[model samples]
Target: RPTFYRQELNKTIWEVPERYQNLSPVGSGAYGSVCAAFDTKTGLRVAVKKLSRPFQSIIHAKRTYRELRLLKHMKHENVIGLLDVFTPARSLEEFNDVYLVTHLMGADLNNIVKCQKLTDDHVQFLIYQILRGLKYIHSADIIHRDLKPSNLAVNEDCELKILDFATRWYRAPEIMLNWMHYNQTVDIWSVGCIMAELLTGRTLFPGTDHIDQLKLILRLVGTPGAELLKKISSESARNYIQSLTQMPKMNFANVFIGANPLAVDLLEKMLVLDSDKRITAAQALAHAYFAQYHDPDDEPVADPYDQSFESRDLLIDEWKSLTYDEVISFVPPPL
Candidate 1:
């Protein structure tokens, strides 16, 4: 139902399939436009993400690859899936944009957390869902990298789904501290932050800058000694942490006020100063806090892709080639 002028090469304007209608723009980011549209054929409303000039920036190209390939491969209730992938192009030369169709949720947890005081049941279920999804993501050997509140989508039914996932500069401290090459533990730290924010009704560490962020974390969690600080791979990071004044660790019970003691203990385990010492998603799921919510009915999902697959940073030329491959080999995924 959205009107547009269909033109070649200029992929900004989209000609959505008529099966989808009543299109209304929902959100926009560095990628491009996102809209909530009713899928006439399926009798469902879906979120559509249109990547504008996907190969325009190296970062965008890399992001497009990560999001596309990961979502294509991942199959879990907690992680969103691709309903379809499309390019509104008639030929290889005309193809320059990409669009992804995903489930349409009411609003993200970031928006909901702001205007509401969630109940104990809400916090418990939401956190459990986060770990549940995380367990699945890490099982695929992919680090979600970004697990902040905004990336968590929610519906009135309390079904929580994770959005686009990644990490880079200005990310979890492993990348922040010494630019260490990290694994799933980086997400565990973000989960700790999300857990605290949900319980206390505030961000546990809202640093104006990464330096202050690092300092605040050390101050509250107890400053690492030179022996522990030596673990950072970078000399500057090791020297920097070593230069900091020692601060005593705050008891977890005191830090996460209004939370159950079991939940407090779980948060403490997940939010360790050293990434190695941080709790795993599977470990967190095993904690006593989620005993009532935990369901063993779920089994680990075995992804169909090669676990060690490395995504390429493609150029515009490479992207043009992929478009031909996509359309030439197109079949609807089981969304």
Candidate 2:
């Protein structure tokens, strides 16, 4: 068992092991505040996220539980690894906060893209890793609803790992159109957006609002025909697209001048306005853009996850107990 001590980070209390020192604030959001710390035991830096009021409400509890479960269950080089989970709370009554520790990287893709120039090789490799990770994720019948540059972390060696979920700029068109039964292809759309951003070092569709976001996408990818609009779950959304003037698809090659034709070809497949026609993670891996580095044997698959918890309509107390059990049962992987 690991020893534990308490340290307040940015006024937030953390009951983490003493080994984690040199706490530096990374950022905070509605979910939690994160800190970068030196792990004397592992001899590497790690990120510690302190979840605020985990059991505050059903939505909060569910999201917290999902993150914790996913981090613990997933094990891949391109997927963030969960190092440890600690809580000062001993019993259900005392359980109020949870701390999650993950391997820390140099910078997220968003920061890297903005700060430096990325050659075609860098872009291809990064996108390949993203697809590689997504293949594993989708293999388990999971959809990473959030896929954006900020959610992708990269190291000094150009190694990448998918971190957290999204912003509007990277959102899928199906999501923007309110498709009721959107599948993993939604993530494919996001992959295209990230690829385009890396190629141009700017957002492809920086929408001002919900409607504007759709308009921007249509303008670039071309307006969908009547048959495609019929698939929209929302009548209002379908009607909106139907009423708009038709747009011809832009030549991606010309848009991304100097980029490899193969790269543009892959981007076109991913950014398909219709989710049904969008490329799958597994299929994207086979595309010529990633042909040089593609290795079927290296691309691993995962067993389908037990997602019954998502459908559970439990009360706060039940969620509290469930989360508490998961936290206490966590066993750090052997070195």
Candidate 3:
């Protein structure tokens, strides 16, 4: 299935020739550049992410391939869809950049969370969707290590979708090397950090540098005891913890003043210092805070089929027979 998807991605990349299309740069990041472009033939809007260069090593290349593979199999409303891929042939100089095509969402959770006061109900809904998405990813044997707010997208309908799969490649070193035993608990740690950030309106661990990030995380989660400390292979990590003895003891709930008790309680379980002790995503989904609102049978149901298409591809020639504007007019406005 993944090999077929990779081929499709390559086809999409080569289809868009350079001079024929106008390229408007949208954003750039550590990986490469992103652009907003129009598919002249289809008249559809798409965001294109072009990679900087092929991975330097085969290991990195394999990881990138794996991401593409997993992404192709993943399909959910609350998860960004991998629409297509762009793998240009060697003959095209501009096609030298590899790209991943995905839906263009309005904004991300990090920015949206800051825009308004999140009601308890709003938080509950967000948490439910996030858990559902995480459940899907975990079921596929993938763990999202960096599940931060900024990596979540908020679509036009206010639904949240998880983005960024770069960090889900491996378990933390604390887990044995080459250990195939994996679980979704790591995402719980990120959820705890995000919850703290949502309450505080700032990053929970906004470290000044990489080292500071470790220290900040340790401060909130607490330093391991002597026995666990000795297990750490890095001397620098050990020394860093030792240097923090003078700081006041940190408690997860204490970070937020007058925060909802339920919210604080959930954070405590997620931010446990010991990874093994941290609540799993499935367990967190069943937390009392969520149980108060979510009912599996009573949850809102989205139509499985795109009624407008009648199970046919909207890109097909038959779709042209229908009035595009009339078809789109059926889409209801946001509540």
Candidate 4:
């Protein structure tokens, strides 16, 4: 049995369980609103995200399932942990929404980056933890398609945690060029972008459109070689790049003025236009830039995860039934 309490958040009524208290809205978007609350039983602050109209569209339903399924299996310090999941609906018929609970971070990197000035050591440790988390996710054979400053969370102690695996400024070149099968290296590219941002407090590749995005990348990293150009899945995309005059790579020191040589070196490797050549998360962790903070013994990898559901196509009701099952499983039996 579960006791539910209803409260209005961001113009929507949410029925969270009795245990969560002091509800205050933190962020709201197309997905839904997240509220900061205190979990009495756990004695920790938590962020409760109310997934908006989860079954309204198949795409939304699938993403909800993907996040829930993948997040449940994650247990890394640098990655946000799923503390609990619940729904107020008494049965499948009434289960139209879902709630996810996670650690309440003080602020996301986007907010902090705008205000605080970070030292070289701070940037190194932050990048180290990001790769550490990616190492675990990649070990599970998952690519965090979305990695950006806004998705990274942090607290007062310089403890950094990743929020979403979900993207625009940080999109990998392979993705823009339409590679048939992009891999974990996509995440590596994002890490490189974030590293540059941390060093300069500015976006590495700020593009207005997909075409502009690709051009901006080329302007800095320079166009990929003829061999690598042939790998693009889209003929038009390949043609566009082929048509451009060859551009020499910009000096990292000049671009990221005063940035440590080691950081610049790692950025060059991570930002490779060819996904095949981009540095992997594990390798980035071991790069000389992170030597002071790297500890192979402390860095752990995740067990291979079953991501078969990522390919499944199910109707809204089917997803509803599955998600309902997942939510109810968290409910305790009569005590």
**TM-score leader:** 2
The top-ranked prediction according to lDDT is 2
List pairs with backbone clashes in candidate 3. 13-86
Clashes of each: 0, 0, 1, 1
Per-residue accuracy of model 2 over 1-335 as CA lDDT, tens digit each: 46777776578877777889888899888768999999999898898889888877998888888888888888888988889988876678988888899888888898999998788999999999999999988888889999998889998988999876337888887778777788999899999999988988889999988779988998889999667877776778767777888899898888888888888999999988878888899999999888888999999998668988998898888887888889989988887
Candidates sorted by lDDT, best first: 2, 4, 1, 3
Over 247-325, each residue of candidate 1 has an lDDT whose tens digit, in order, gives 8889988766667898889888988877888899888888889998887677365464563424555675675565456
> In candidate 2, which residue pairs clash?
none
Off by over 4 Å in 3: 1-23, 38-44, 55-60, 86-97, 166-184, 225-251, 292-335
Q: Could you report the Cα RMSD, in angstroms, for every candidate shown?
A: 3.6, 1.6, 11.4, 2.6
lDDT of 3 by residue, 1-335 (tens): 11112222322332344421444566677766666667554565667776654444444344444455455556766666666664544323322334676666677886788787677667777777787677666665567777777789886677888887522211232332222443567677677767766666666766665555666666665667666566556676567557766444476556776778888898888777566677876677778888765565533322232222333333322222232222222321222
Each prediction's TM-score versus the true structure: 0.89, 0.95, 0.66, 0.94
**Candidate 3 accuracy as TM-score:** 0.66
Candidate with more favorable, higher TM-score: 1 or 4? 4
Clashing pairs in 1: none
Off by over 4 Å in 4: 330-335
Weakest 10 consecutive residues of candidate 2 by summed lDDT: 1-10
Q: Rank the candidates by TM-score, best first.
A: 2, 4, 1, 3
Better of 2 and 4 by TM-score: 2
